[PDB]
Curated annotation (Swiss-Prot):
Disulfide bonds: C255-C290
Keyword terms, alphabetized: Aspartyl protease, Disulfide bond, Hydrolase, Protease, Signal, Zymogen
Superkingdom of the organism of origin: Eukaryota
Protein name: Endothiapepsin
Domain named Peptidase A1: residues: 17-328
Known catalytic reactions: Hydrolysis of proteins with specificity similar to that of pepsin A, prefers hydrophobic residues at P1 and P1', but does not cleave 14-Ala-|-Leu-15 in the B chain of insulin or Z-Glu-Tyr. Clots milk
Residues annotated as catalytic: D35, S199
EC number: 3.4.23.22
Shown residues in whole-protein numbering: 90 to 419 of 419
GO biological process: proteolysis
Family: Belongs to the peptidase A1 family.
């Protein structure tokens, strides 16, 4: 089997991407944030504290004839950005782009943190990291991909995120028309539960490539590109007037600037992030100070190849017995 679904930016800045997901019988379609950095499929629901729901579409398990309460199961998650959610668990039928899993754990939120409430466009998350990170207790549950894998034509999914435009998540096949040149594959460590890999280096603008190993995670659920302070300083030094602002929370730059590209290495291959992908717009409405899309990972504890990086590539998440990652230009 295969599946193919369009993923759409939630706003004009590509702060996140939402993908429609069918849950239950009859289908209840929710728009979920596909997150290769976590491993829970959780939704706003009829059980979510009413004051914490503000415009989201909810899953109502009592209206699904295939929903079954997973007795005694609870979940609770905290994300890198400080947001969180928790609740109980159903199993139900879940379909993405024509690909159907029966008996998928659907984690129903009883509580969500304010950042989720305040984002009306995201109805929940669909985790695509390794199932070892799943938070369901006392019996850990499998991701949608893990459940689908054996049925797929090939045990892969691909992320093709758009810049200021829709893109595609495919399951079970590689669309050879969706990229240019070849796909370069690179080793993955699953030791921390992530799609963790080592970039071979970087360049800023038309500058020379610096060969250096950068361990980090391919994370569709993180907006920005978080890299070591040395690398980030080298980038922003090429933007006149750019500075790190402790009050704002990262590097800012004059909105009048033209940003240089940023290149990262995948083996001997190179992925070029155009400068415009690194512009996250005014820090507050009407400001002429703009927020940068490349930020320091210092104090995160890990480097993160988030959407800024991934959207410059066609990305293969190869879930073979030994997983790997592939990157192509597009």
């Amino acid at each position: 089997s295969t599946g193919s679904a369009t993923t759409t930016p939630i706003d004009s800045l590509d702060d996140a991407y939402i993908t429609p997901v069918q849950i239950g019988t009859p289908a209840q379609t929710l728009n979920l944030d596909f997150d290769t950095g976590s491993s829970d499929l959780w939704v706003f629901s009829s059980e979510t504290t009413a004051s914490e729901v503000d415009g989201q579409t909810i899953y109502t398990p009592s209206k699904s004839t295939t929903a079954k309460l997973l007795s005694g199961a609870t979940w609770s998650i905290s994300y890198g950005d400080g947001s969180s959610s928790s609740g109980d668990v159903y199993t139900d039928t879940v379909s993405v782009g024509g690909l159907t899993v029966t008996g998928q754990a659907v984690e129903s939120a009883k509580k969500v943190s304010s950042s989720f409430t305040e984002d009306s466009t995201i109805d929940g998350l669909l985790g695509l990291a390794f199932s070892t990170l799943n938070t369901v207790s006392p019996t850990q549950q499998k991701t949608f991909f893990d459940n689908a894998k054996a049925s797929l034509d090939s045990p892969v999914f691909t992320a093709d995120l758009g810049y200021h435009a829709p893109g595609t998540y495919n399951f079970g096949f590689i669309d050879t028309t969706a990229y240019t040149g070849s796909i370069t594959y690179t080793a993955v460590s699953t030791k921390q539960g992530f799609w963790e890999w080592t970039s071979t280096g970087y360049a800023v603008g038309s500058g020379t490539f610096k060969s250096t190993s950068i361990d980090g995670i391919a994370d569709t659920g993180t907006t920005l590109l978080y890299l070591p302070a040395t690398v980030v300083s080298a980038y922003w030094a090429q933007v006149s007037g750019a500075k790190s602002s402790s009050s704002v929370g990262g590097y800012v730059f004059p909105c009048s600037a033209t940003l240089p590209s940023f290149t990262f290495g995948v083996g001997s291959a190179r992925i070029v992030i155009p400068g415009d992908y690194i512009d996250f717009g005014p820090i507050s409405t009407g400001s002429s100070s703009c927020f940068g899309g490349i930020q320091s990972s210092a104090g995160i504890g890990i480097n993160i190849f988030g959407d800024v990086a991934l959207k410059a590539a066609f990305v293969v998440f190869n879930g073979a017995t030994t997983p790997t990652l592939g990157f192509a230009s597009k």
